Amino acid sequence: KNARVIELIAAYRNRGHLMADIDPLRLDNTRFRSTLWDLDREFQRKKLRDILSVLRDAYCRHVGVEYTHILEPEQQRWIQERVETKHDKPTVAEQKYILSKLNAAEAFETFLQTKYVGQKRFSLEGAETVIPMMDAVIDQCAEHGLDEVVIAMPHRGRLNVLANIVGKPYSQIFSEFEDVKYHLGATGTYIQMFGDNDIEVSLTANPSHLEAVDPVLEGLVRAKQDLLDTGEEGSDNRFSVVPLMLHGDAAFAGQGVVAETLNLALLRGYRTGGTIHIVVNNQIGFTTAPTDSRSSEYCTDVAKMIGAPIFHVNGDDPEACAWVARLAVDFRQAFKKDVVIDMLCYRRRGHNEGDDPSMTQPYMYDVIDTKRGSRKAYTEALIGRGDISMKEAEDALRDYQGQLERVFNEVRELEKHLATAVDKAMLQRIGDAHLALPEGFTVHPRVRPVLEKRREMAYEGRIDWAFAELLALGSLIAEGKLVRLSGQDTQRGTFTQRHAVIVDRKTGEEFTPLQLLATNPDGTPTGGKFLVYNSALSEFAAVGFEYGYSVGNPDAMVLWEAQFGDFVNGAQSIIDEFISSGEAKWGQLSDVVLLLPHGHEGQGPDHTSGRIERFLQLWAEGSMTIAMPSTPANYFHLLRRHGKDGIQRPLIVFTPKSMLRNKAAVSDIRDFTESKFRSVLEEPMYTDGEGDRNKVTRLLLTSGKIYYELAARKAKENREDVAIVRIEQLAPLPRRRLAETLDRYPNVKEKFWVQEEPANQGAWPSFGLTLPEILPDHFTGLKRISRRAMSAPSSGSSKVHAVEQQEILDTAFG
Amino acid sequence: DKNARVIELIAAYRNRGHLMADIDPLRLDNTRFWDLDREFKRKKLRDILSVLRDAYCRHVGVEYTHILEPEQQRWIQERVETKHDKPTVAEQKYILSKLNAAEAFETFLQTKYVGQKRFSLEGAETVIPMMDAVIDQCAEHGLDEVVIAMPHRGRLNVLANIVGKPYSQIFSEDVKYHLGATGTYIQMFGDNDIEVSLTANPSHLEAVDPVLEGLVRAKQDLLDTGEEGSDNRFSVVPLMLHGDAAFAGQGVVAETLNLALLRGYRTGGTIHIVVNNQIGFTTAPTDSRSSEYCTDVAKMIGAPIFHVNGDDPEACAWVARLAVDFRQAFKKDVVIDMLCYRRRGHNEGDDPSMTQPYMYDVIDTKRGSRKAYTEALIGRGDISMKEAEDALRDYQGQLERVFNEVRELEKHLATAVDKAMLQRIGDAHLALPEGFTVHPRVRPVLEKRREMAYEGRIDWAFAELLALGSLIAEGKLVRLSGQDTQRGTFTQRHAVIVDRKTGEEFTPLQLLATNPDGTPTGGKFLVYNSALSEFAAVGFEYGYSVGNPDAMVLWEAQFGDFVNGAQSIIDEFISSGEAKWGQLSDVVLLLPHGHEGQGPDHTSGRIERFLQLWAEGSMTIAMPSTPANYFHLLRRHGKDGIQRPLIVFTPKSMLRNKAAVSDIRDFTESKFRSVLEEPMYTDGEGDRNKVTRLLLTSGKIYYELAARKAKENREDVAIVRIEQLAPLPRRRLAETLDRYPNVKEKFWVQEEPANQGAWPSFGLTLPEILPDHFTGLKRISRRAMSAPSSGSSKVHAVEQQEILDTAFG
Ligand SMILES: Cc1ncc(C[n+]2c([C@@H](O)CCCC(=O)O)sc(CCOP(=O)(O)OP(=O)(O)O)c2C)c(N)n1
Ligand SMILES: Cc1ncc(C[n+]2c([C@@H](O)CCCC(=O)O)sc(CCOP(=O)(O)OP(=O)(O)O)c2C)c(N)n1
Ligand SMILES: [Ca+2]
Ligand SMILES: [Ca+2]
Ligand SMILES: [Mg+2]
Ligand SMILES: [Mg+2]
């Protein structure tokens, strides 16, 4: 009999949530419907009736608890102890405060729908309990003495969140009203009602693309945590900046970026010490029922992927919603792990103006039409429970009216009225750092010559691309800059060229040579730091995270590296919605760098192109910098200009693969110490040699590694009649430098744009249209030499590639 | 108290025993690992404990207590917690032959050719007898086909030893590692056979996952099995292979798992095999995931997960067969996490000890699962010394055969319908089932559709249903899906209508699947509301068109602006599948497009990006301006006998523009017109010779330009529409412009920013393909923008008016 009791306790803990009264609409009519002598027997000693009452109150009332899937026994025990105890009833003051938050939320929803037209799609009606729930999250974070709560959410209830959570005044919110305000960033200060603490509250910008902002929030919070010296890269483990992420039920289950972002939660390179997730589960997605939106019992089932506790709560019970919000913050503080709150509610009205929701959901909306809002329900429950008197409920209705009056009145009143060159000692210091190994450190025999060659390059020149990148990042760290670099296998490098982190052959201990540059020769810190990580196998979440990280710390140097540029299309939503367009749409600035390994080498259509043409198509004056450098020193100056220009603009770099090891693609020490970024490059025979520019009758304009192949062919046939000009900066077009360079070749009779990429790809679709328009005296008659237009970035065969590469070389010199 | 401790101990093994199971063949985690004669209710505590250790703590880690269905938990419990019959010596020798063939293939591949290391299955050979066990168990269930999707690793090994392709066809002439293949699997110890196919894929890991599901669902619908079938067998099985780093990191995995039990997307359960070699290129699992297992995402749909030791090919084969049986019993996904290792470096330039010295010092002391299983069968006494010798002569014989075989290879149409068809589709909207209650606001839509069918003024929404309805009447399977596609985002479609009193669904176009005499046409209308996914949903529909080339398959974006969420499918499959793999798709993407002041995410389907991806006959790209031209576009696409994707930029407010309606004769006596002139010149009293300014455009801006022309009586201006954007209708465009001899200036007019819409490609292409017609072509558009439009509807309205005033200035 005592074995049956242990099985009964486990059944309530494991599956009690399936019986919990969580749906305020009670749509599922079969949810609840599908010995007595032992009830008074004792089984710590407790009677079976007392065990069953504790289990029912904890697991089968307005809170459905999912936690037995958690592999950590200490986390399961922590939830058990706090959920399976008699809870102290909230004070009348706390209850009145919860009611006053529901009064503010409904008074805001009432004014919006009444004052303006076309506001229905933004309505939080049937879900107003999310306002005292969010208030409880922020208040509990303030109680923990934390510094900031950063929110990401979709558009539903956003302005209500602006007024009743962020604390933005109505005059600012509805200043020259109308849609753009449902996507803008905001900041405020939350002051505790019953406490003496305060906390910063911010709301990040987002597109309409639901859940796309999720990794952006995490990056943004991580950047703020690194700046506050809290968390993973901090001295304290408080993670004093809390991500609060809101979601819709259909989007949370359907968008892949949710899983990608959850997968980052405990990674050393991406953890934020746990996110508080709130799903506004109104059991609908426009006209779509949950049975067409997901293959699981709950919209939050994806969170089981990382063993996050999940709390399903009845949105018509704001006390249970506030209690669960505070429990979620406490769990996050104790275990530094994500918590999901599934708030079951409803969408009172139609999705938008042209929607009578009974057309597609007659049953749900016949039930919704018999519902009285959370505010009225809570006022009626408190009255029935004897917690408040008739005068107190009447005073609360007076508070609702005064709050509705205030917003109508306040809005009425508003209606009435730089050098990048470094010294040689800097290069030598970065070279020496590669050999300044910790005591007893064992280097892998294949990594040892790379280190020794870097010391040699630092003092003797012939600096290759891989070392020039580290010279640029190392010199920024020495100057006090925080440098964050990440991507797939970025510590070692996809092409075994980087070795930013080296691994002890016997212990596996990591050593980061560039980190030595964060300390000045005298021993004082520079203020700089090198944060280098291997990312998860994600593009969408990883690019979103790095974009968010550059927003969170505008003073950081933030670089994301694609394994091959070909895989960045997995992050297209981030490129389209944030990187290329965030500045013009929201005034949100990012200095994020995308490194895209690019080049035709015969490795197939998915190991060849970063789709230059797509980034050039997205570009519009002053949105991004787009470059394809051909020399290590020009890449070094490109990165240093980007980190020191004081301008927050994304940089897109088309980086090499085989050209990393091309012996002609090396730079002299003077190119680092006495030069700057060159947007346009001429052949060294004309700038440093005995070449005669006046013999040139044919000019080849190009970008990237094909220059070396064109230069080798010119050298082989002694073609003095042909010159090769490189466009290093593809966007913005270096109009003046390009015009001044071409004027130095007066006998040119024909000009060709030469590229490896197909005719419908690379720089030709934009340069072929733009160059004759911006420089008509220089580029009227410009012709293209390239691969034929293709539906894929290249052929699948390395043999076909080699024939096509040779046809480009023969056409340019034909 | 003692009996209570036993019940708690049993639960502990069932719930968490998989944490102590000996699943890692490398044993890298060094921290990983009384009265027992009393009989409890009746068996001894020692025997109860031994059954739990063998079931949960040996070479198989079982995760199943997360499953909400008690009958599924019970089914696994009964099959795992019992004394299993040891495999016969014949089955053991057969598992060994599959380990011999797979390892020999690997040794041949790393010796004969250079640049192959990156495809090596060494350290993971056990996936070959595991896949063989899956397919053999599906054949034992009498199923029709197993369709495989997998990444690069072991692909050619899978082709020869699973698909059964000959070496002459495999090594004939990197492309081979991405092509589709088909074969017949013949049972070794059984009398059944089953079709085995391998689908094509890009290098983009996990991208093929929803494509496989779509492909399988199309095959299931054709075989009348599953969700849309008469039987519940789901006789076409998706077998999906994965890598451990990709399975945890790619969002498309979760999106595809989310489709597994949906009425519009279910395939009756997928068998998932993760080749968990505990590494991702140079990245350790602790940098790749925030969960204990790479397969933890599968708990999202309550799938059972089996973690298996890849050095134990018997446990791997047993788990594969159990997985098939679970899939058949519950029509739900099963995940097999095969723990193994990657013997060599990721590729030619990789010494894996540089980044993982500890793992590769352990890997260097490992003997293959072939040498292991051969020696373990001697240790067990299951095979003799002569048997072990002959098994080595099987290996050498297999190694010789492939060297000798490749040595020998190296030596040697009208779209118009009759008025009765239109009337039938109109009548269908009022042919309600007995006792059906129409929603009052849906009632006038059905009555207006009968009226339009007989009297004309046919709007866009009805013209679409006239095209789909007429195809169904002709015997075509029509599959239509997308976010809120049954009703339509703009409340315009009503393909499915909902009973106000019962919630019963009624599909008017489904009545056209039955001829007037009562016989079936062979056609069907499959219309669904999709999940809130773009990547998986677009991938699924692309896959569905590949699986049934005879189906009319349409995917509709809520707004064209959200299709960038499916960019990997557009780039890797739709735009390029034909040229890269010879794989054909006739998939239709419907992208609601147009500048109306709803912001940068409710305005553009990015025409410029699709036009940039296009290269000679890869896709058809269109932006129709009339309901009848859209009708003929869809009917041409469904009847042309060409498998080519169609990209359609569809309207939003133009759905209700009273000028954007068509006459019955436009459906009954016309065809698709790639180029459209103004009706005043083709049917009216307009004089083409008065025209001095020619405006070329596409889409709804035509109506605004035509309204302005009419207002000012501008006989000097003509508006020509390009309905088919790609391929450019060169001949029809040249012949149309020749009819306006007094034209002194030509303008391309568009709503979209200068760096967007059709101008970036037309501005470069039109003066090149038709120099006598388009030299001097100028652009009238919005200024170049970093976003598709402004955020303000006020700014939009000013910009729309500046375009109209510039065109008539
Ligand atoms: C990636 C992505 N894919 C599609 C859309 C389109 N989309 C929406 C909007 O863009 C407006 C479109 C409708 C209109 O106004 O005409 S709402 C929505 C339904 C949301 O359901 P859920 O999460 O349950 O939340 P709620 O119940 O709280 O609304 C979807 C699909 C998008 N924005 N982002
Ligand atoms: C979406 C996406 N993002 C990135 C890549 C790049 N990528 C791969 C290749 O394309 C490049 C390397 C080519 C070469 O070797 O020359 S393999 C890989 C590691 C796979 O790990 P896991 O799943 O564990 O499998 P395995 O262990 O069995 O290898 C990653 C990251 C991709 N193809 N797709
Ligand atoms: Ca900058
Ligand atoms: Ca076709
Ligand atoms: Mg919803
Ligand atoms: Mg792997």
Curated annotation (Swiss-Prot), chain A:
Binding site for Mg(2+): 249, 282, 284
Gene Ontology molecular function: 2-hydroxy-3-oxoadipate synthase activity; 2-oxoglutarate decarboxylase activity; dihydrolipoyllysine-residue succinyltransferase activity; magnesium ion binding; oxoglutarate dehydrogenase (succinyl-transferring) activity; thiamine pyrophosphate binding
Effect of residue 351 to A: 40-fold decrease in KG decarboxylase activity
UniProt-reported outcome of changing residue 183 to A: Loss of KG decarboxylase activity
Regulation: Alpha-ketoglutarate dehydrogenase and decarboxylase activities are inhibited by unphosphorylated GarA, and allosterically activated by acetyl-CoA, the main substrate of the TCA cycle. Both the phosphoadenosine and acetyl moieties of acetyl-CoA are important for activation because neither CoA nor the synthetic compound S-(2-acetamidoethyl)-ethanethioate (which mimics the terminal acetyl-phosphopantetheine group of acetyl-CoA) has an activation effect.
UniProt-annotated binding residues for 2-oxoglutarate: 183, 208, 607
Gene Ontology biological-process entries: tricarboxylic acid cycle
Catalytic activity: glyoxylate + 2-oxoglutarate + H(+) = 2-hydroxy-3-oxoadipate + CO2; 2-oxoglutarate + H(+) = succinate semialdehyde + CO2; N(6)-[(R)-lipoyl]-L-lysyl-[protein] + 2-oxoglutarate + H(+) = N(6)-[(R)-S(8)-succinyldihydrolipoyl]-L-lysyl-[protein] + CO2; N(6)-[(R)-dihydrolipoyl]-L-lysyl-[protein] + succinyl-CoA = N(6)-[(R)-S(8)-succinyldihydrolipoyl]-L-lysyl-[protein] + CoA
EC number: 2.2.1.5, 4.1.1.71, 1.2.4.2, 2.3.1.61
Cofactors demanded by this protein: Mg(2+); thiamine diphosphate
Residues annotated as binding acetyl-CoA: 625, 641, 676, 679, 729, 736-737
Keywords of the record: Acyltransferase, Allosteric enzyme, Coiled coil, Decarboxylase, Lyase, Magnesium, Metal-binding, Multifunctional enzyme, Oxidoreductase, Thiamine pyrophosphate, Transferase, Tricarboxylic acid cycle
Binding residues annotated for thiamine diphosphate, in chain numbering: 156, 208, 210, 249-251, 282
Keyword Metal-binding included in the entry's annotation: yes
Residue runs in coiled coils: 387-417
Effect in UniProt of substituting residue 385 to A: Increase in KG decarboxylase activity
Gene disruption: observed consequences: Cells lacking this gene do not show any ODH activity, in contrast to wild-type, demonstrating that this protein is part of a functional ODH complex in mycobacteria.
Cellular compartments per GO CC: cytosol; oxoglutarate dehydrogenase complex
Function: Shows three enzymatic activities that share a first common step, the attack of thiamine-PP on 2-oxoglutarate (alpha-ketoglutarate, KG), leading to the formation of an enamine-thiamine-PP intermediate upon decarboxylation. Thus, displays KGD activity, catalyzing the decarboxylation from five-carbon 2-oxoglutarate to four-carbon succinate semialdehyde (SSA).
Free-text comment on this protein's domains from its UniProt entry: Is a fusion protein with two major domains exhibiting structural features of an E1 and E2 protein, and a short sequence stretch of E1 localized at the N-terminus, which is connected by a linker region to the rest of the protein.
Family: Belongs to the 2-oxoacid dehydrogenase family. Kgd subfamily.
Name of the protein described by the UniProt record: Multifunctional 2-oxoglutarate metabolism enzyme
Segment of the intact protein contained: 366 to 1227 of 1227
Swiss-Prot record, chain B:
Protein activity control: Alpha-ketoglutarate dehydrogenase and decarboxylase activities are inhibited by unphosphorylated GarA, and allosterically activated by acetyl-CoA, the main substrate of the TCA cycle. Both the phosphoadenosine and acetyl moieties of acetyl-CoA are important for activation because neither CoA nor the synthetic compound S-(2-acetamidoethyl)-ethanethioate (which mimics the terminal acetyl-phosphopantetheine group of acetyl-CoA) has an activation effect.
Gene deletion effect: Cells lacking this gene do not show any ODH activity, in contrast to wild-type, demonstrating that this protein is part of a functional ODH complex in mycobacteria.
UniProt KW keywords: Acyltransferase, Allosteric enzyme, Coiled coil, Decarboxylase, Lyase, Magnesium, Metal-binding, Multifunctional enzyme, Oxidoreductase, Thiamine pyrophosphate, Transferase, Tricarboxylic acid cycle
Protein name as catalogued: Multifunctional 2-oxoglutarate metabolism enzyme
Coiled-coil residue windows: 382-412
GO cellular component: cytosol; oxoglutarate dehydrogenase complex
Originating organism: Mycolicibacterium smegmatis (strain ATCC 700084 / mc(2)155)
Listed result of changing residue 616 to A: Loss of activation by acetyl-CoA
Catalytic reactions of this protein: glyoxylate + 2-oxoglutarate + H(+) = 2-hydroxy-3-oxoadipate + CO2; 2-oxoglutarate + H(+) = succinate semialdehyde + CO2; N(6)-[(R)-lipoyl]-L-lysyl-[protein] + 2-oxoglutarate + H(+) = N(6)-[(R)-S(8)-succinyldihydrolipoyl]-L-lysyl-[protein] + CO2; N(6)-[(R)-dihydrolipoyl]-L-lysyl-[protein] + succinyl-CoA = N(6)-[(R)-S(8)-succinyldihydrolipoyl]-L-lysyl-[protein] + CoA
Sequence segments annotated as region (2-oxoglutarate dehydrogenase E1, C-terminal part): 1-809
Portion of the full sequence shown: 365 to 1227 of 1227
Keyword field contains Transferase: yes
Pathway the protein takes part in: Carbohydrate metabolism; tricarboxylic acid cycle; succinate from 2-oxoglutarate (transferase route): step 1/2; Carbohydrate metabolism; tricarboxylic acid cycle; succinyl-CoA from 2-oxoglutarate (dehydrogenase route): step 1/1
Signal peptide positions on this chain: none
Residues given in the record as thiamine diphosphate binding sites: 153, 203, 205, 244-246, 277
Domain notes: Is a fusion protein with two major domains exhibiting structural features of an E1 and E2 protein, and a short sequence stretch of E1 localized at the N-terminus, which is connected by a linker region to the rest of the protein.
Positions contributing to Mg(2+) binding: 244, 277, 279
Binding site for acetyl-CoA: 620, 636, 671, 674, 724, 731-732
Lineage: Bacteria, Bacillati, Actinomycetota, Actinomycetes, Mycobacteriales
GO MF assignments: 2-hydroxy-3-oxoadipate synthase activity; 2-oxoglutarate decarboxylase activity; dihydrolipoyllysine-residue succinyltransferase activity; magnesium ion binding; oxoglutarate dehydrogenase (succinyl-transferring) activity; thiamine pyrophosphate binding
Amino acids binding 2-oxoglutarate: 178, 203, 602
